[PDB]
Amino acid sequence: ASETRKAYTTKMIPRSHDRMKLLGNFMDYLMDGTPIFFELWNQFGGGIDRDIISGTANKDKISDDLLLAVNWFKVMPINSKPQGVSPSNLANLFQQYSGSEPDIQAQEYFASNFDTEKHQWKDMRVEYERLLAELQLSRSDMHHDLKLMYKEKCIGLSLSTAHYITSVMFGTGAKNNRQTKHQFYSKVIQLLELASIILKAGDCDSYRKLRIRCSRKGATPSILKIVQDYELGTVPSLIANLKEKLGRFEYECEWKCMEKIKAFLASKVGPYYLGSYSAMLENALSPIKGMTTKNCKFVLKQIDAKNDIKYENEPFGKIVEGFFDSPYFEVKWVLHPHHIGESNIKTLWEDLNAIHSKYEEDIASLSEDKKEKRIKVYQGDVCQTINTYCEEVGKEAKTPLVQLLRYLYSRKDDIAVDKIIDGITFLSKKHKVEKQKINPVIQKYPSFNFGNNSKLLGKIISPKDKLKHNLKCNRNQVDNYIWIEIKVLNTKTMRWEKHHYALSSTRFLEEVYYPATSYEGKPALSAEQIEQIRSAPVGLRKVKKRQMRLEAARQQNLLPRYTWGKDFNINICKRGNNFEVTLATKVKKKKEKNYKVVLGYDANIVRKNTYAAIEAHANGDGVIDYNDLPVKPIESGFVTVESQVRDKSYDQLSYNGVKLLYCKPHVESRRSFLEKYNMKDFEAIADDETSLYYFNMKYCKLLQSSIRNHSSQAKEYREEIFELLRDGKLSVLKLSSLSNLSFVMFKVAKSLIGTYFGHLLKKAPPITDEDKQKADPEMFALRLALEEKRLNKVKSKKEVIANKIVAKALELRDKYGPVLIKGENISDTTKKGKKSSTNSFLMDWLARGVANKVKEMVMMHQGLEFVEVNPNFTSHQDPFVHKNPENTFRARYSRCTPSELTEKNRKEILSFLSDKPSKRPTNAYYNEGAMAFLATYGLKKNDVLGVSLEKFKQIMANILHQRSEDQLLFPSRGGMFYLATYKLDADATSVNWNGKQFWVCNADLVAAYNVGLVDIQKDFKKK
DNA sequence: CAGACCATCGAAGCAATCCAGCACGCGAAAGGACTG
DNA sequence: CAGTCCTTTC
DNA sequence: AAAGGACTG
RNA sequence: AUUUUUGUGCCCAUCGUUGGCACGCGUGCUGGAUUGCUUCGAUGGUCUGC
């Protein structure tokens, strides 16, 4: 039984200045009262101590000392009341309290990094003492009270729901059946320590009503006791649960100091109301308990990570870090393994040791006075080798520091190679683990959820009561506004009074609200509705069209019934003088395990994210027998989202813009401006086949470089920058798709504005964002426009890709059965070792974003389920033959004509053929792919590794002409057209390799199938 | 062979953005009182 | 009693 | 322990 | 309790054919990166008599 929330983000229509001011006063009252509860609960937690937490003692792995340190040592902003503790003396303070020194978990908590500029430790136990002093309540009485709170889960970790805490500590009356319930439970266990129903009924109770009226009154029935009795009249492991619940129901809830605390709250906050106090405490506890749990898990993670630091490589770390106090360095920084080609330095030192052996054997002979020259030659050779290594490893990752490698080689006798790697990775991991900031306890900006059951009373009126009201008072009965009846506290006269406010969210109408007076599509409108749509102002026409479609669907009985149910929350966040009603809604799923389809998707960056469906227990013509599971490919395609312009049909995700054949004035203006500032590179971007957003991106980079060169006149660039990014018909803001290139375009636009500002404000105080806002307010506004446009662009890309994925999942669910959407677990990209360009490229991936959006959407549909799989080798594994018997791991190719072969392709083929050891597992797969490429056409690598790439193209053309085919497959590390043994593409062109007769599928579709077979066995057990 | 010019590549500082994780909120069901 | 609200407990 | 996942429209 | 004028937005050389289409919101921190300026250091090369 899973559940998630919807959200409809409505718009508050000001009913009247008086009513809106009343609502604002109520909101301000709640907001002003929230900090009081925040501080009060910080004090309560501060009062925690041993003999308070030594009760249930239930906790995952948190030490009894870490709980104490968490509840009375919190990092908060410097500008707060509890201020006054420095990190150094945290240990001795924790010694002063609790009569013991910090343990490992509490030592890690105290010795945690943070931002000393903004956040400061805080004693949090002088705050409890200040509560005792300023409310003058006996320390013993407050000790009893907060011990009772802890046992009631009103303080500590895993707190209870705010409503419950308020009702318990500040409530009128009670069951008072604590001792009564304890006796009942002791009797029940004594009768155990449908038959259980008889045993429970033996509590001097005839039926459920009697025991309800005797043991547990005025609440929901105790754990499966009254419901159990009813079920049994209309397993033995529960004894431990009932015995551990006996800790409760023993105290009788006598508060020795909650009266004084309640009076203090009434002094600071208004008079006690369960709804108001519950809301304020709900918005005050969230930061407290949230950051408490976050820091507990964080400290556990920190101890686990520090246990992974070897700490025996520390001397090697010292030797390597001696780089900073050596002639080769000219400030000081941390050394990460990417500075030495993390694992390639082994090959580097192999080569350098070969050179050293040659040099030494040459120095043994030639013992004349030529040493001063031979050593110089050897020094030059080793320097050249190190430079070549840095250049070589600087293609797939960051260039290793030349000076660091020179220093390491100079210290070739003080440290080995594996020891160099261990020391530097120690320097890296220790530094990382030591810079992990601890989460501060920051105050939440409140939400104040109005509901019906346990929150501040309130409700959307109804679709039914709406008709009653709109008919009682003469009205169309089909208004486009949603009315909420909120119980507002009139702060003038401190009493409650339900008022009404109008929301105007059209989605709520279209989807769950509008009444069925008489997933779907849309209706056919009438003439007058069309006229209204066409007569509305420009900015209102879209919402008018949506509303008229809704109205037509109601008038033509095309509007499905929406089964109101009155299950909507109302979240009112008052930022300034405007409200932010939200209308959340619970959705319940009842997850299913007996899957019938698997819908993997590959989640590419530039290559048109694909899906691929796989059946579970297929029985038909093609049913591939996996390890022990009969599976069948249903289909596989691309995720293309269609925006149908007048007659064409674009893919927002891959359109890439118009072809510059219709942007000639645009390109002419750009060239005219660029000519004024120094153009053989412009002509390479302005071809009439080049697409518009490639042209815009490349021209943004051109402007960036131009501004860099003409630094002292970057103010002259602003007219062109505007005309390119904002104003003109073909601009980054006027015209841009969801394609990856259209996001690189916004990235380069933001970079262009950044360089314009950096060179417009450079003459040394730093250039703060306020300084550049004041320097060119229009350009800063343009920067904000680009940022907001790109953020909404990203939100829409996530939403639409996830919509297509979930739509195909629903199609398969309707056709076959419960679907399982398997997505790559694309984490830990954008690494330090990678190049800056690689990390920037991978930032636009939005893999985890789409995965999260699909995860959310799947929680609302019954039948779908989303698991995230390991993305390892999912682009090479041959689907349905890899792991069906044994791993296959073929390579990806690139069909092309011999005339369009480039130098890069030939060099890549040679790199595959060159028998050199590499740590990448896929090197073997692409090497065997290159061998098979040579075998297929008989190229005789010795004679194929030759020069004259033109001669290579001629030889390939002759080989492919002797055969009747037109294109040659050849392995490429970034090529499509994977070779599968099964037809997974639906456009696959069969081909003959050494002698296997593969299918030329699409690398995207086979990768989607692999994503659908990563752990197929786990999803489908043999049951 | 001394000297300067480009260029890219690292490191750090400074000021910014950004995708992402992750903790929390978006309570239920009951009885009594009340009202119609 | 239907529906409301206000409370306590799960 | 990375690599892999991505492959610069 | 009636405001009849809006939830957020996304795509397009013709911005409408009723254009086409999608959507969980908020707070707060944290992690990893990126962007821009500068400083420093390496790396590669053209150039002037040598």
- Whether any strand C atom is under 7 angstroms from the Cβ of A180: the reply reads no
Tokens 């920190």 -> residue: A302
In terms of Cα–Cα distance, which of A887, A970, A982 is closest to A929?
A970
- Whether any strand C atom is under 7 angstroms from the Cβ of A251: the reply reads no
Does residue A534 share a domain with residue A488?
Answer: yes
Ramachandran area for residue A483 (φ above 0: left; ψ -120 to 50: alpha; else beta): beta
CATH number at residue A628: 3.30.420
Mark the nucleotides of strand C covered by protein, meaning any atom under 7 Å from a CB: 5-10
Distance E13 C1' – A720 CA (angstroms): 20
The token pair that represents A344 in the structure block: 């390639």
Q: How far apart are CA A970 and CA A906, in angstroms?
A: 10
CB A725 within 8 A of CB A736: no
Q: Residue A213 phi/psi, 5° resolution?
A: -75, -15
Residue A43 lies in a domain: yes
> Which protein residue's Cα is closest to nucleotide B18 at C1'?
A843
Instruction: Using the CA of A510, give the nucleotide whose C1' is nearest.
Output: E7
Residue A221 lies in a domain: yes
**Nearest 5°: CA angle at A948, between A942 and A949?**
90
Does residue A193 share a domain with residue A164?
Answer: no
Tokens 């790697």 -> residue: A421
* DSSP at A578: S
Q: How far apart are CA A469 and CA A594, in angstroms?
A: 48
In terms of Cα–Cα distance, which of A190, A272, A196 is closest to A231?
A196
- Whether any strand D atom is under 7 angstroms from the Cβ of A344: the reply reads no
End-to-end CA distance of chain A: 22
Angle between helices A126-135 and A17-46 (to 10 degrees): 110
The token pair that represents A634 in the structure block: 């249903």
Contact residues for A604 (Cβ-Cβ < 8 A; gap 6+): A610, A1004
Contact residues for A566 (Cβ-Cβ < 8 A; gap 6+): A452, A459, A460, A462
- Whether any strand C atom is under 7 angstroms from the Cβ of A946: the reply reads no
Domain boundary among the residues A384, A403, A434 is at A434
Helical (H) or strand (E) element with A624: strand A624-625
Beta-bridged to residue A449, according to DSSP, are A571
Does residue A905 share a domain with residue A790?
Answer: no
Burial A180-208, CB ≥16 within 10 A → b, else e: bbbebbebbbeeeeeebbeebbebebeeb
Tokens 């501040």 -> residue: A456
Query: What is Dmax (Cα atoms) for chain A?
Result: 117
In terms of Cα–Cα distance, which of A843, A821, A877 is closest to A1003?
A877
Strands A449-451 and A456-460: parallel
Q: How far apart are CA A90 and CA A799, in angstroms?
A: 47
Distance B4 C1' – A710 CA (angstroms): 20
Residue A1013 lies in a domain: no
Query: Based on the structure, what is the number of domains in chain A?
Result: 7
CB A876 within 8 A of CB A922: yes
Instruction: Using the CA of A646, give the nucleotide whose C1' is nearest.
Output: E19
Distance B10 C1' – A325 CA (angstroms): 18
Mark the nucleotides of strand B covered by protein, meaning any atom under 7 Å from a CB: 7, 9-12, 14-32
Helical (H) or strand (E) element with A792: helix A777-815
Strand C proximal residues, A:483-542, Cβ < 7 Å: 485, 487, 496, 498
Q: Residue A798 phi/psi, 5° resolution?
A: -55, -50
CB A892 within 8 A of CB A976: yes
Does residue A453 share a domain with residue A559?
Answer: yes
Q: How far apart are CA A874 and CA A890, in angstroms?
A: 11
Q: What is the DSSP string of A129-170?
A: HHHHHHHT--HHHHHHHHHHHHHTTSSSSSPPPHHHHHHHHS
Domain boundary among the residues A539, A557, A588 is at A588
Q: How far apart are CA A1003 and CA A984, in angstroms?
A: 10
Burial A5-30, CB ≥16 within 10 A → b, else e: ebebebebeeeeeeebebbbebbebb
Q: What is the DSSP string of A280-328?
A: HHHHHHHHHHHHHHHHHHHHHHHHHHHHHS-SSSHHHHHHHHTTTTSTT
Distance E48 C1' – A376 CA (angstroms): 29
Domain boundary among the residues A795, A822, A837 is at A795
Q: How far apart are CA A158 and CA A152, in angstroms?
A: 11
Does residue A915 share a domain with residue A948?
Answer: yes
Does residue A996 share a domain with residue A921?
Answer: yes
Q: How far apart are CA A53 and CA A57, in angstroms?
A: 6
CB A595 within 8 A of CB A812: no
* DSSP at A113: B
Ramachandran area for residue A1000 (φ above 0: left; ψ -120 to 50: alpha; else beta): beta
Strands (E), A733-849: 819-824
Distance of CA A818 to the CA centre of its chain: 26
Alpha helices in A435-564 (DSSP H): 464-472, 506-508, 527-535, 541-555
Tokens 């769950």 -> residue: A512
Q: How far apart are CA A882 and CA A452, in angstroms?
A: 55
Does residue A568 share a domain with residue A471?
Answer: yes
In terms of Cα–Cα distance, which of A794, A704, A800 is closest to A756?
A704
The token pair that represents A18 in the structure block: 């008086």
Residues of the domain holding A820: 597-646+799-869
Does residue A787 share a domain with residue A732?
Answer: yes
In terms of Cα–Cα distance, which of A106, A98, A28 is closest to A67?
A106
The token pair that represents A559 in the structure block: 């509007």
Residue A323 lies in a domain: no
Q: How far apart are CA A930 and CA A924, in angstroms?
A: 10
Burial A941-951, CB ≥16 within 10 A → b, else e: beebeeeeeee
Residue A885 lies in a domain: no
Q: How far apart are CA A642 and CA A628, in angstroms?
A: 40
The token pair that represents A702 in the structure block: 């051109």
Q: How far apart are CA A796 and CA A653, in angstroms?
A: 10
Neighbours of A782 (CB within 10 A): 23
Q: How far apart are CA A686 and CA A695, in angstroms?
A: 6
In terms of Cα–Cα distance, which of A596, A600, A592, A595 is closest to A880?
A600
Q: How far apart are CA A364 and CA A500, in angstroms?
A: 99
Q: Residue A399 phi/psi, 5° resolution?
A: -65, 120
Instruction: Using the CA of A465, give the nucleotide whose C1' is nearest.
Output: E1
- Whether any strand D atom is under 7 angstroms from the Cβ of A300: the reply reads no
Distance B36 C1' – A513 CA (angstroms): 27
- Whether any strand D atom is under 7 angstroms from the Cβ of A607: the reply reads yes
In terms of Cα–Cα distance, which of A67, A62, A70 is closest to A440?
A70
> Which protein residue's Cα is closest to nucleotide E30 at C1'?
A439
Q: How far apart are CA A305 and CA A861, in angstroms?
A: 39
Does residue A680 share a domain with residue A550?
Answer: no
Alpha helices in A111-257 (DSSP H): 126-135, 139-151, 162-169, 178-190, 195-201, 208-214, 226-233, 238-244
Residue A160 lies in a domain: yes
Beta-bridged to residue A989, according to DSSP, are A1000
Distance B12 C1' – A344 CA (angstroms): 26
Residue A973 lies in a domain: yes
CB A114 within 8 A of CB A77: no
Does residue A270 share a domain with residue A167?
Answer: yes
Does residue A271 share a domain with residue A360?
Answer: no
Does residue A613 share a domain with residue A487?
Answer: no
Residue A321 lies in a domain: no
Structure determination method: cryo-EM
> Which protein residue's Cα is closest to nucleotide E14 at C1'?
A646
Contact residues for A239 (Cβ-Cβ < 8 A; gap 6+): A189, A192, A193
The size of chain A, in residues, is 1023
Helical (H) or strand (E) element with A989: strand A989-991
Quick check: helix, strand or coil at residue A991?
Answer: strand
